[PDB]
Design a protein around this ligand. Structure first.
Ligand SMILES: Nc1nc2c(c(=O)[nH]1)N[C@H]1C(S)=C(S)[C@@H](COP(=O)(O)OP(=O)(O)OC[C@H]3O[C@@H](n4cnc5c(=O)[nH]c(N)nc54)[C@H](O)[C@@H]3O)O[C@H]1N2
Ligand SMILES: Nc1nc2c(c(=O)[nH]1)N[C@H]1C(S)=C(S)[C@@H](COP(=O)(O)OP(=O)(O)OC[C@H]3O[C@@H](n4cnc5c(=O)[nH]c(N)nc54)[C@H](O)[C@@H]3O)O[C@H]1N2
Ligand code: F3S
Ligand code: F3S
Ligand code: F3S
Ligand code: FES
Ligand code: FES
Ligand SMILES: [Mo+4]
Ligand code: NA
Ligand SMILES: [O]
Lengths: 135, 118, 824, 134, 118
């Protein structure tokens, strides 16, 4: 009793300096059934982390009906093959065009300068096909 | 299946008592060349029944089980139709399930009688 | 608060049926309602969804986001969780929700949510300020004015623009109630429709040729060899018909069903043809799904549809790719149409700009007999690109000539059909006049005492909208000025003050709405209406499938069903006449003794064609009486396709899949009638714009935005995405004007000036543009002309103008995606 | 040329309107041929619809043609003429009686897309007819 | 007798190697509902042959022995037609008298396979 927040795990993804510009890294968060991508965009964006404030991370499950989306490096979007929804990786998962009614969920990363570590520590948005982000 | 070859108006007609039980119900056997048939108009078939429209209840007893094609000793093929006689006092046109099968239980090379001793 | 979880519906939750509020498709949904302090368990048998939330769900298992949930507060003060989700077993959508349908829960009325500015009581502009007033004061003023106008001017002084449509803000109850009031009681001819400025049809030519515009099933799109989408962006505008029916055909999922129906007919891989000047998301997605080899984008010059169809008709006739036995048995006028419509492929190509090879290919795919001998099953789907096109009547004449000659009506897998806009739900008395009347022009010229906007907003959606707003705001001002000299006047004195103001150019304006809208800039009176779920409502989709949307919650405040608003008005008028000793005038307002919306259904839809009924025009037909609310409930979200053929308790409602399958058309002689289709170029008024100014100002739908954004304007996600109406522009045009994404431009011509944010789009052709229509920030229609066809149908897609940079909106650059909306 | 009868395709109803063990009446392949469709409530070989349980029959007795009546308690068709009874759960199998043919089955297409049941053929010969299609 | 039901253009077609001798000739099995049939026009039947006029020698191997009506476990009746594959390298469309009877020697309740152990 009491608690209003979900008990998110703290999961190491990588050190920031290992990420190459526009080369997505795959990981699971907050458990192995929830596929995510982190990408260094190469140019600062609102809420980007790391040395150049440019690293973002998302749940890749489409928020319409749950197909794994694919990161397109040329547009920096996530595209869903199910009903052609496309999300903007540079505008916090904003839906460019599609059938979803939620933005692509953001994986919240802590960036520690001391260690260079990126740690997944939360999700902003609801992951498809889940009652709560933490099962 | 879903149709029957009608006996022509001039088809051969013989008398046949049921093969089976004591009642001895009266039937007619219609016999005719395989490549002929009756018309649907009542005067163009041997039954005298109007097959241009649905028949009412009790008008006929007629199923595919009451029909066959026999192959005679001369190699020629003939439609047969074995049906109850309406004017027989015994049965007044009734056929039991047993007598109703007589046509099917006549000897043919490919039918129910195929294993007849020859 | 709480972005990262959802309250599941308990296993025993209440569940009602709801048809989607918005587009023609009419997708089926379920509404789960339950006390706020209860929830479902994650185990599949402990929640109402029957889904297993103890581990991740697979793709396609569910459509469920927080936008599909809400907490309502009812008239008793008690709070209930709601969940509005698509029905997996509805045939229309098979569990699909669009982004528009998907937001229904969010767009239900709650005190703190997106619906928080719902109209909850009568609003009065008391000369110089907005105030609340009572229903009885509102009726005394509104009925009082109408009565005064009837007594002095007759019905010609009383004006309406009203919905004629289905779904939310329409439907059979509502169209009957309004129509009975306007036409049987008041008996005014001064009535326009929500989307067009006279009392007319979108489909005069096809109807007159004997082919009502909704003549097939959605299953027909599954059975077709070829689909034509003419002036139509169906991925965005009729999403789930495109997704659930068209795409499965293009993917080969329906091939085995075609073969089972027609055992001795070849079924090649299905193909699709788009007639659209613009390369749309629908074109792109069709290419992605089917390959470039199974899509033909006939990227015509704007307004050249008639040339296109005359050239194809000429060609199929010359090749003999027509049904001569069908023509001979079931048609009239063919030989004449061959003469009047003759156009060579070379002439066709010069006018349209489409190469001759593409014209021939489209004919080959669509009309040349298959190997097995049968003509291709070609469904011809059209919408607003031709309905609001270059001479609505003539284009339909041309198109239908092609369809009829090729027997693409009445065969399964065919149809020449509207895609539709709203749902349908029309039952009304006949229009009481003998003339088409261009209502906006009448208003602009200073006619009328009182104008009511009912469930529409022509400030945002009229053609030549700037002329309209100008005139209405000024006429509204005259009434405002006259009202404010009053102090302590009775209602009846106020009626006289206002009426006098209207003799000096004024106009009393009433809006019957969900929300204030931009009409609040002019209105003197606003009445609160109720939408589906706050009321019961019946309507049908693009294949005539009638469904009951069930009430599950209260309206805000004293908001009422529009049919019951109409009854309230009628009863007020009756009472005034009775009091004034005018028995004959009172009698005209009888027949609105209605306590619930069902009463309107019984009085209208269920009376059509019955003994002792008056003249009623109903899409239910004369068997509408077989439909009841209880029977529709038993039918589910699948309803029945109209017309109903039979009913009994054991069978349910049995209806009609496709029209015209025996070759009997809706004309005097039972034959389909060919018509001449002259090519006369663009209208002189439009051509003048094109001659003076640089850009074709195409306009229409965005997938995410519904209509005039009446809900969407209050949705923080929607406003972050589209804070302003956007204009798709060619990148090279953009460079020439020194604009990029998130700059603001003025768009202007002789008809008006409006504003948009720049959206660079590589697929837009040089000298062409595309602006979102009807929006709350930058109204597109200001630059549309006053030109209409013979039946007063506007060429909304026919205007030209210039573009001027205002400047860079840095905030749009920071927050709005200008990435491509054409998927590849 | 043709070896088959030209059966019409006749809409009966949508499957989901049928209640378990409540017979629906219709005519097929013409108005003089009475038929019944029933949802049995339990899958049977060759049943159609979502639960593979909808079946349909000619109700004219294949003995001498009286309209039979569907008994809901036994799921049979009983003939008042000479007491033939057919099993609706065994494709018209004669349980006891004087007929020499099972009760003809109306062949239904079930379309998932529309939920339509369409009568498209008959298996067996209907009483008092030279062919099922007159 | 004197006619055959053609396979519809969209008839199901599976591969079958002859049941019998070493040669292993290739055949096609066409299966379709009993109450459907192909048209005589070559594009309206599964064989692709023109039955609107007499066929020339070698155009087909097709007799009634190469046809049957099976009754499946669901009670539904289906036409079958078991004919040699013209493009099989082993036989180039030839059928022996033995393989040619495969249709007849499929199990049906009333045919040559009627006494099959069940
Ligand atoms: N997302 C969403 N969907 C909706 C709506 C909504 O507001 N939002 N509104 C609904 C309503 S009321 C309606 S009416 C429908 C309308 O649906 P549609 O008519 O499908 O949509 P529009 O964008 O108005 O126009 C379709 C196409 O017409 C083309 N066009 C323009 N000029 C011409 C021309 O001369 N000829 C041809 N052949 N094409 C031309 C445009 O490029 C455009 O892609 O959508 C309904 N569905
Ligand atoms: N330039 C240009 N102009 C166009 C078009 C175009 O393609 N180009 N499209 C045309 C088309 S096809 C259309 S459909 C029209 C649309 O023109 P409108 O009909 O003017 O706009 P909508 O947004 O459908 O209007 C619905 C209104 O009713 C309200 N409403 C919603 N539910 C209810 C209800 O239950 N009761 C009542 N009383 N009010 C309710 C909403 O708040 C809103 O104000 O615009 C037309 N205008
Ligand atoms: S079995 Fe007996 S009842 Fe009659 S038909 Fe044969 S004699
Ligand atoms: S969800 Fe609604 S918006 Fe149309 S596509 Fe379906 S009726
Ligand atoms: S028996 Fe032998 S010759 Fe051929 S058709 Fe059969 S494999
Ligand atoms: S499942 Fe992703 S767009 Fe539908
Ligand atoms: S007529 Fe039916 S049992 Fe004899
Ligand atoms: Mo519209
Ligand atoms: Na004041
Ligand atoms: O519309």
């Amino acid at each position: 009793a009491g608690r209003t927040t979900l008990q998110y795990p703290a999961t190491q993804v990588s050190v920031a300096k290992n990420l190459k510009a526009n080369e997505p890294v795959s990981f699971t968060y907050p458990d192995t059934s929830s596929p995510c991508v982190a990408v260094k965009l190469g140019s600062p964006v609102p809420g980007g982390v790391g040395p150049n404030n440019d690293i973002v991370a998302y749940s890749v499950l489409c928020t319409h009906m749950g197909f794994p989306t694919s990161y397109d490096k040329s547009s920096k979007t996530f595209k869903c093959p199910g009903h052609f929804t496309e999300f903007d990786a540079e505008k916090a998962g904003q839906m460019i065009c599609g059938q979803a009614t939620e933005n692509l969920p953001r994986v919240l990363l802590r960036y520690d300068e001391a260690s260079d570590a990126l740690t997944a520590v939360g999700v902003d948005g609801l992951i498809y096909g889940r009652q709560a982000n933490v099962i | 299946n879903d149709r029957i070859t009608l006996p022509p108006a001039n088809a051969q007609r013989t008398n046949m008592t049921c093969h089976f039980c004591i009642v001895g119900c009266g039937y007619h056997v219609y016999k005719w060349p395989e490549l002929q048939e009756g018309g649907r108009a009542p005067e163009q078939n041997a039954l005298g029944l109007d097959f241009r429209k649905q028949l009412p209840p009790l008008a006929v007893t007629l199923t595919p089980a009451m029909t066959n094609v026999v192959t005679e000793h001369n190699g020629r093929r003939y439609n047969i139709m074995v049906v109850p006689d309406k004017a027989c006092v015994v049965n007044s046109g009734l056929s039991s399930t047993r007598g109703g099968k007589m046509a099917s239980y006549m000897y043919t090379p490919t039918g129910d009688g195929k294993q007849r001793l020859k | 608060a709480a972005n990262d979880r959802i309250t599941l519906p308990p296993a025993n939750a209440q569940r009602t049926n709801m048809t989607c509020h918005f587009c023609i498709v009419g997708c089926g949904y379920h509404v789960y309602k339950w006390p706020e302090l209860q929830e479902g368990g994650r185990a599949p048998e402990q929640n109402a969804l029957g889904l297993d939330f103890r581990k991740q769900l697979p793709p396609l298992a569910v459509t469920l986001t927080p936008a599909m949930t809400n907490v309502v507060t009812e008239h008793n003060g008690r709070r209930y969780n709601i969940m509005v989700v698509p029905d997996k077993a509805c045939v229309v959508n098979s569990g699909l929700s669009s982004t528009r349908g998907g937001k229904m829960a969010s767009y239900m009325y709650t005190p703190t949510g997106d619906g928080k500015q719902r109209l909850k009581a009568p609003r009065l502009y008391a000369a110089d300020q907005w105030v609340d007033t009572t229903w009885d004061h509102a009726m005394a003023l509104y009925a009082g004015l109408i009565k005064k106008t009837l007594d002095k001017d007759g019905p010609q002084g009383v004006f309406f623009s009203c919905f004629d449509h289905g779904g939310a803000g329409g439907g059979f109850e509502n169209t009957w109630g309004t129509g009975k009031l306007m036409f049987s009681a008041i008996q005014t001819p001064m009535v326009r429709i929500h989307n067009r400025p006279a009392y007319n049809s979108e489909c005069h030519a096809t109807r007159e040729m004997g082919i009502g515009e909704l003549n097939n099933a959605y299953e027909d799109a599954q059975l077709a060899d070829v689909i034509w989408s003419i002036g139509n962006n169906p991925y965005e505008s009729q999403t789930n018909y495109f997704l659930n029916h068209w795409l499965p055909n293009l993917q080969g999922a329906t091939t085995s069903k075609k073969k089972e129906r027609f055992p001795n007919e070849n079924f090649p891989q299905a193909r699709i043809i788009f007639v659209d000047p613009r390369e749309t998301p629908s074109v792109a997605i069709a290419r992605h799904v089917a390959g470039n080899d199974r899509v033909l984008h006939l990227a015509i010059e704007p307004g050249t549809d008639t040339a296109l169809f005359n050239g194809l008709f000429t060609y199929v006739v010359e090749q003999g790719w027509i049904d001569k036995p069908f023509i001979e048995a079931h048609t009239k006028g063919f030989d004449d149409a061959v003469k009047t419509n003759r156009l060579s492929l070379d002439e066709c190509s010069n006018i349209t700009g489409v190469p001759v090879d593409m014209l021939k290919r489209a004919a080959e795919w669509s009309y040349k007999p298959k190997a097995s001998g049968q003509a291709p099953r070609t469904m011809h789907a059209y919408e607003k690109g031709i309905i609001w096109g270059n001479d609505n009547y003539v284009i339909q004449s041309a198109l239908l000539d092609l369809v009829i000659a090729t027997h693409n009506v009445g065969r399964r897998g065919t149809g020449c059909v509207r895609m539709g806009g709203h749902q349908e739900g029309y039952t009304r008395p006949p229009y009481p006049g003998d003339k088409k009347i261009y209502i906006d022009q009448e208003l602009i010229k200073g006619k009328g005492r009182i104008m009511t906007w009912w469930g529409c907003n022509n400030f945002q959606t009229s053609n030549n909208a700037q002329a309209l707003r100008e005139a209405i705001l000024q006429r509204s001002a005259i009434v405002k000025q006259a009202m404010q000299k009053a102090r302590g006047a009775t209602t009846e004195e106020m009626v006289d003050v206002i009426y006098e103001a209207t003799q000096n150019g004024g106009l009393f304006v009433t809006s019957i709405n969900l929300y204030p809208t931009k009409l609040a800039e002019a209105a003197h009176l606003m009445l609160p209406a109720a939408h589906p779920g706050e009321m019961n409502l019946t309507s049908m989709n693009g294949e005539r499938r009638i469904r009951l949307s069930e009430k599950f919650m209260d309206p805000p405040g004293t908001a009422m069903a529009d049919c019951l608003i109409a009854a309230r008005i009628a009863n007020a008028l009756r009472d005034m006449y009775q009091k004034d000793g005018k028995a004959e005038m009172a009698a005209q307002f009888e027949g609105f003794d209605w306590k619930t919306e069902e009463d309107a259904f019984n009085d209208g839809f269920r009376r059509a064609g019955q003994p002792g009924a008056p003249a009623i025009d109903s899409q239910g037909g004369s068997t509408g009486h077989l439909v009841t609310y209880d029977r529709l409930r038993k039918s589910g979200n699948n309803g029945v396709q109209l017309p109903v053929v039979s009913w009994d308790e054991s069978k349910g409602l049995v209806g009609t899949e496709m029209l015209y399958t025996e070759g009997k058309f809706d004309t005097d002689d039972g034959k389909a009638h060919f018509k001449p289709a002259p090519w006369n170029g663009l209208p002189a008024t439009v051509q003048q714009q094109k001659d003076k100014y640089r850009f074709w100002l195409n306009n229409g739908r965005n997938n995410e935005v519904w209509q005039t954004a009446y809900h969407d304007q209050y949705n923080s996600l929607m406003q972050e995405r589209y804070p302003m109406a956007y204009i798709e522009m060619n990148p090279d045009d953009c460079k020439q004007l020194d604009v990029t994404g998130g700059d603001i431009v003025e768009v202007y011509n002789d008809f008006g000036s409006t504003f948009a944010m720049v959206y660079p789009v590589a697929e837009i052709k040089r000298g062409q543009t595309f602006m979102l229509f009807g929006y709350v920030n930058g109204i597109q229609g200001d630059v549309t002309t006053d030109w209409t066809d013979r039946n007063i149908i506007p060429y909304y897609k026919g205007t030209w103008g210039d573009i001027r940079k205002v400047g860079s909106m840095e905030e749009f650059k920071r927050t709005v995606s200008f990435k491509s909306r054409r998927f590849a």
